[PDB]
Design a protein around this nucleic acid. Structure first.
Lengths: 142, 86, 152, 364
RNA sequence: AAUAGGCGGCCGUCGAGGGCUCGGGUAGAAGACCCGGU
RNA sequence: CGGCCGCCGAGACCCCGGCGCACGGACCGAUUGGUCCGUGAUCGGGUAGGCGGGCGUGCCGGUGGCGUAGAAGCCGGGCC
RNA sequence: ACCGAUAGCGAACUAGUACCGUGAGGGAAAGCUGAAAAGCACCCCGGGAGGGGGGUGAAAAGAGCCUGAAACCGGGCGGCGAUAGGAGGGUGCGGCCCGAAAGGAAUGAGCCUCCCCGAAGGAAACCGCGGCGACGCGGGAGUACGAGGGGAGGGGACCGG
């Protein structure tokens, strides 16, 4: 089991690496989902996520796309998008992932890994909005 | 002996070759390290204890993966599973 | 003699058998009742059939249950009271009990190890309908076979 | 152009299904600084009317006006449990719950029949009709240890909320014997204060007078009267079809367009009507009466029970509430009340209004 | 709610609890739900 | 956007083994043929259509046989 | 050198019959017990129809009668079986199960170990050098390996299906 501190990490690259590990067959726990960053313009990102949450089935809301609003759920769905979700292998790989906001009591005092391919130091300018800010705009709990 | 992970079949985007598998050994991360394993056997264990035999024939890519040819192809439940080199 | 049994391992020293042919009852309800009665003791099965006839206990339906209302209690679910089928199967069970007694087995240790219902010959008839159409009106008959064994 | 009109019925009360339980649940609680239990419970008895001098702001202020009221019988509740809530990952999670040990019951209306002495009822016997699995060999000492452990957890600070578990006593008013067990929040900002408030009344009786204030607004929660299966005309208030319709008049005409090739959930259809969980807002508590009697002007006391008794209900014998207007539910239904959660900016004064006449004539 | 939840209590490694049956509706198309049963 | 480096990727191309075909050759068949060798980078998809060979069914003239120690037929399997 | 009961005349048989239309006129379906009825005496159960024993027969072939196919229905056994999506299949293998004969096999199976040759193809450790870099070049070396073709030793029941 590998624990990854999502603080100061690019969401897409972190999700790609984590999906790769899950497919190779490891157990991954992400510990700081609310601190992941998304580069771009704040208004554009907010509009995109608002439209994603607005997607729903007209004939029955109980079947519509349930796009997430919490930070950990946003990270989980981003990772799920990079997996063969429509296959047994993809479902099993997704079942080996846990995402949390903040460090839970059970993970305190443990080794927290990081991905240098997703750190914010790669960016020329730090123009990004955190998943926590996105969830706050969307109205999620955290 | 060495431990390895079965990654996938030898494949294109929409074509699959059943008797060749891609295997990643634990502590190899280059073609130079992976080339030392050419000619070594690869063993896979079935749930009932049956042993399936293959041999490493070529390196794959540049990150340390290798190609193993199996006389009888792996079932496909071996994807992401562990195999023994030698 | 005229009809054979689907049971393969019949042992005359420990088992008894009986049957009824060309019964004017519903084969589907006969199948349901036989499925309920399979694996039961003879006296318990007789009490079951008596309760079904008296309407104190519904028979669940697992295969033929279209447009069937549920019943009070757990496991219901569609159920009904096939009184005619219950009476016919009760007659068959009494016959098998007599056969076992005449063989010499104890009636209180008999378990129904085989019971089956089959579709028999169809008696054909017609019923008039609108626009000068003659339309089938048929009776489906049932064969019942039972084999019981003495347990020790 | 076409003709516009609002849609038939509201989509904010869907699904229109039968209530999960006949005992109402309370999802939200008002924020208060006073340390008191935030609500009460009772049984719906009937409706009557009064004439009162209006005190609420408006055009008819100071003029004697007609007012319909509902009488809710509220025998004292029994406070028998305390529950503690910690903060979980996704919300409140109960950490522990302590109930008092068994005690003799003295308010049970035992009657001498031919042979045998008084039944001599005790608690955990009426409660068994609801819980059915109660502690065995439970002692005051063990109860004290459990309470001390709960208090120690509160001191450590793992507890973020405390609530009181109460039970109704229908046997006092001879309505029935099976009680209703409910959970109630306590106002205030100190968990220690709330814990002391519950602890001082654990195992005791709480009366509506010690909880609620006359003349204040309340929210009323109950399950409405059941109507069975009802068609769309009554369920959603659709318009009857043209009188020349040969396939029926009490049905929706078109249940959807060609595309989407499915029936949308918004099309009215027949189904369950009534027996729904509902909440009513801003119902004034006109008065609180004791022992089935209401005092008027320190020298007149009247019986709230009308001549011949309430229809489909007995005689009021315990404390009761007078609620302005109507409340959801049937006769003898369990009704929960809480302090109003969204009162108007200009609320009426918190005191009993001047009552000039109370109707006690036959209601049947 | 597939991360398919929390807590108190009773039970098992004969037996807690429940169903049919009984008298009635705060309920009802069958099921279900609710009160009572010495 | 202007360039470069390494990999991965077909039934394509290369190699080993097998089949058929077209043409030529040797040898051998009492009615269309059979065995073997040589060449094929310059033979091997295919609708309409043309041509060659082969499998199966009833009966007749011959020839050689099987069967109550179990024919035809039918059911489930092995081999070619 | 015709057909062999949906064929041959429409009719192999109580067939131009049954039956349809007021009427001219139209017009089916339907063969087979066994060598011999030897066509089940007697007992138990059932209101009966029948069921179970017991008899006849080389064989129930039991009159609902030569063989009894397919579709369909009921039961038994093997496999799957209530979080999973594609016309119900194709390639490969794994799990469970069957596996006497007709396939191989104690004159030796799956399996384990070792040795020789080898087409097209074909690395790397390390050393020297070029490039800002990804990297490349000469040696190692056409070496290790390589489809397939042969040999020896061990074990003793599976392999194919």
């Amino acid at each position: 089991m590998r624990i990854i501190n999502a603080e100061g990490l690019i969401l897409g690259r972190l999700a790609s690496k984590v999906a790769k590990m899950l497919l190779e067959g490891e157990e991954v726990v992400i510990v700081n989902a609310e601190k992941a960053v998304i580069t771009g313009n704040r208004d554009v990102i907010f509009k995109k996520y608002k439209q994603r949450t607005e997607l729903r089935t007209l004939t029955n809301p109980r079947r519509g796309p349930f796009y997430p609003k919490r930070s950990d759920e946003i990270v989980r769905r981003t990772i799920r998008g990079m997996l063969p979700w429509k296959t047994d292998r993809g479902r099993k790989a997704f079942k080996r992932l846990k995402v949390y906001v903040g460090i839970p009591k059970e993970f305190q005092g443990k080794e927290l890994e990081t991905i240098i391919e997703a750190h914010v130091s790669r960016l020329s300018r730090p123009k990004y909005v955190t998943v926590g800010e996105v969830a706050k705009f969307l109205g999620g709990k955290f | 002996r060495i431990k390895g992970v079965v990654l996938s079949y030898r494949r294109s985007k929409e074509n699959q070759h059943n008797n060749v598998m891609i295997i990643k050994p634990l502590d190899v991360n280059s073609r130079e390290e992976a080339s030392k394993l050419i000619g070594r056997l690869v063993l896979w264990k079935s749930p009932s204890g049956k042993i399936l035999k293959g041999k490493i024939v070529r390196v794959h890519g540049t990150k340390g993966a290798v190609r193993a040819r199996f006389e009888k192809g792996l079932p496909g439940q071996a994807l992401g599973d562990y195999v023994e080199i030698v | 003699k005229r009809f054979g049994y689907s049971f393969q391992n019949f042992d005359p020293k420990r088992m008894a058998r009986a049957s009824a042919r060309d019964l004017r009852i519903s084969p589907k309800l006969a199948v349901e009742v036989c499925r309920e009665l399979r694996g039961m003791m003879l006296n318990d099965a007789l009490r079951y059939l008596d309760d079904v006839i008296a309407l104190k206990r519904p028979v669940p339906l697992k295969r033929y249950n279209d447009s069937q209302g549920h019943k009070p209690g757990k496991g219901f679910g569609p159920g009904r009271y096939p009184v005619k089928v219950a009476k016919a199967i009760k007659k068959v069970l009494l016959n098998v009990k007599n056969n076992a007694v005449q063989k010499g087995l104890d009636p209180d240790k008999l378990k129904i190890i085989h019971i089956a219902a089959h579709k028999g010959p169809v008696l054909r008839g017609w019923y008039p309908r609108a626009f000068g159409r003659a339309t089938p009106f048929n009776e489906q008959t049932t064969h019942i076979e039972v084999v019981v064994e003495e347990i020790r | 152009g076409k003709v516009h009109r609002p849609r038939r019925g509201s989509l904010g009360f869907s699904p229109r299904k039968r209530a999960k339980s006949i005992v109402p649940r309370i999802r939200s609680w008002p924020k208060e600084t006073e340390v008191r239990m935030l609500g009460f419970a009772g049984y719906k008895a009937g409706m009557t009317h009064i004439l009162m001098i209006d005190d609420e702001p408006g055009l008819t202020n100071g003029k004697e006006i007609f007012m319909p009221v509902t009488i809710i019988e509220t025998p004292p509740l029994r406070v028998f449990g305390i529950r503690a809530y910690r903060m979980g990952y996704l919300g409140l999670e109960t950490a522990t719950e302590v109930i008092v040990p068994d005690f003799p019951l003295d308010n049970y209306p035992a009657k001498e029949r031919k042979g045998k002495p008084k039944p001599k009822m005790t608690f955990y016997k009426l409660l068994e009709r609801r819980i059915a699995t109660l502690p065995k060999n439970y002692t005051q000492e063990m109860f004290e240890q459990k309470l001390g452990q709960l208090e120690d957890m509160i001191k450590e600070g793992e507890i973020v909320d405390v609530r009181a578990i109460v039970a109704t006593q229908p046997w006092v008013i001879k309505l029935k014997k099976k009680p209703e067990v409910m959970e109630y929040a306590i106002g205030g900002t100190s968990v220690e204060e709330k814990f002391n408030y519950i602890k001082e009344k654990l195992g005791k009786e709480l009366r509506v007078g010690e909880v609620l204030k006359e003349g204040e607004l309340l929210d009323v929660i109950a399950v409405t009267k059941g109507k069975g299966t009802q068609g769309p005309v009554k369920r959603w208030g659709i318009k009857l079809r043209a009188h020349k319709d040969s396939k029926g008049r009490r049905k929706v005409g078109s249940i959807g367009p060609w595309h989407p090739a499915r029936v949308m959930w918004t099309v009215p259809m027949a189904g369950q009507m009534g027996f729904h969980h509902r909440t009513e807002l801003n119902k004034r508590l006109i008065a609180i009466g004791e022992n089935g009697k209401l005092k008027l002007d320190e020298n007149t006391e009247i019986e709230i029970t009308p001549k011949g008794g309430f229809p489909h209900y007995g005689i009021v014998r315990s404390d009761f509430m007078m609620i302005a207007g109507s409340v959801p539910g049937a006769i003898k239904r369990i009704i929960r009340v809480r302090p109003a959660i969204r009162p108007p900016k200009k609320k009426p004064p918190v005191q009993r209004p001047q009552i000039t006449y109370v109707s006690v004539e036959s209601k049947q």
